[PDB]
C-alpha cells in the first residue's frame, strides 16, 4: 500500500525539511505535509502492479522464423537471444543482473502457398521443435538422425490444438543472468567485447514432421518468453537510443528528450 497524508497545520521554526544539500547523493524524503498544510487522507492505493514480477511476467514475442513444406528452407534454426526484439529486451535492461524461470509458448501458423499444383488436399501438419544445448549435434537436414531427440528435449505439436507451452529453469552458470558485460572473452582483453561473450544458450530447430500435401505450405514459428519467478539486481537508466544490434550496445546518439520552445512554454512542440 501507499502512505496516507498526515493532517498538518502552520509552522514557524528552524526545522527545515525543505532545504538540503543534494550533493550528498541522497534523495530527499520531503512529503506534502512538510511544505504546506495537509489534510488527513487514507491511502488504499497499492503498488501491486509495479512489482518486478508483474512488470516482466507477460508473454512477449522474442523472435520468429519460417520453414517450408518443400525446397531449401525445410527446417528452421534460431540461436537463442532475447535481444532481437526491442520490447522485451528493453524491460530486462532496466536491471544489470536478472535471475528467473521461463515459460515458453509457441504460436505456429501455416499458410498455403501459390502453386500450379492441381488437386491439393492437405493432410494435418504436425511440427517438431527441438532444443540443441551448446555442444550437441545439429540437424543438417530435415531428416538427419539428430531429430530422434533421444536426450534433447523436443515438442511435437499437431495443428489446430492449443499452443505448445513448457517452462524452463534458470539455466545459467552464474548466480544470475548478466544483462551487460563490460569485458572480453579472452584474457588478452581481446576477441569479443560485451554481452555476446556470455550468450551461450544453444539453438532451437523446428520442422514439419510431415509435408501433408502436394501443394506448398510455409509455416512461421513465433517464440514467446515470459519471465516467471524473477529476481533483478542493480537497476539502471532505461534505453534512450534505439537498438542497432542484437549482440551489442551499439547505439546511434540521440538527444536527451524532445523539444518545446522557451523554458516557459507549457506545451510540447
Amino acid at each position: 500500500r501507499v502512505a496516507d497524508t498526515v493532517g498538518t497545520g502552520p509552522t514557524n521554526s528552524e526545522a527545515i525539511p525543505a532545504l538540503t544539500a543534494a550533493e550528498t547523493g541522497h534523495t530527499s524524503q520531503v512529503v506534502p505535509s512538510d511544505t504546506m498544510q495537509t489534510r488527513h487522507v487514507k491511502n488504499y492505493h497499492s503498488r501491486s502492479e509495479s512489482t518486478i514480477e508483474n512488470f516482466l511476467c507477460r508473454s512477449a514475442c522474442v523472435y520468429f522464423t519460417e520453414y517450408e513444406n518443400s525446397g531449401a528452407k525445410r527446417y528452421a534454426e534460431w540461436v537463442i537471444t532475447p535481444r532481437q526484439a526491442a520490447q522485451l529486451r528493453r524491460k530486462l535492461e532496466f536491471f544489470t543482473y536478472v535471475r528467473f524461470d521461463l515459460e515458453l509458448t509457441f504460436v505456429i501458423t501455416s499458410t498455403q502457398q501459390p502453386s500450379t499444383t492441381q488437386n491439393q488436399d492437405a493432410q494435418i501438419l504436425t511440427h517438431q521443435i527441438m532444443y540443441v544445448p551448446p555442444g550437441g549435434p545439429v540437424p543438417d537436414k530435415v531428416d538427419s538422425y539428430v531429430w530422434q531427440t533421444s536426450t534433447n528435449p523436443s515438442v511435437f505439436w499437431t495443428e489446430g490444438n492449443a499452443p505448445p507451452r513448457m517452462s524452463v529453469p534458470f539455466l545459467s552458470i552464474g548466480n544470475a543472468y548478466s544483462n551487460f558485460y563490460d569485458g572480453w572473452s579472452e584474457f588478452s582483453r581481446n576477441g569479443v567485447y560485451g554481452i555476446n561473450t556470455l550468450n551461450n544458450m544453444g539453438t532451437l530447430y523446428a520442422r514439419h514432421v510431415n509435408a501433408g500435401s502436394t501443394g506448398p505450405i510455409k509455416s512461421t514459428i513465433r517464440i514467446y518468453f515470459k519471465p516467471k519467478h524473477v529476481k533483478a539486481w542493480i537497476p539502471r537508466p532505461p534505453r534512450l537510443c534505439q537498438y542497432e544490434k542484437a549482440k551489442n550496445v551499439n547505439f546511434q546518439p540521440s538527444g536527451v528528450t524532445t523539444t518545446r520552445q522557451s523554458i516557459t512554454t507549457m506545451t510540447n512542440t
Binding site: R1, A15, I16, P17, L19, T20, A21, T24, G25, H26, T27, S28, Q29, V30, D34, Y44, S46, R47, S48, T51, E53, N54, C57, D101, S167, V168, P169, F170, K228, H229, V230, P235
Partner: protein, 55 residues
Amino acid sequence: GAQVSTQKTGIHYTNINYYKDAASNSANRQDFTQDPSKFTEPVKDIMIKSLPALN
C-alpha cells in the same frame, strides 16, 4: 496438499501444483515487499529531514 491464498481485491483462491519441478510453477504476483533506502538515501551518515544537510 493445497494452498488457499488471497485474491487481489480493493476472498480466497485455492491452489495445488502438479509438477515435480519448481520451475513448472505459476508466477509470484503477490510480493509487494519494497526497500527504496538502497537507492534513495545510500549515505553512510544518517540524514534527518528537519535538520540542515550540511552543518
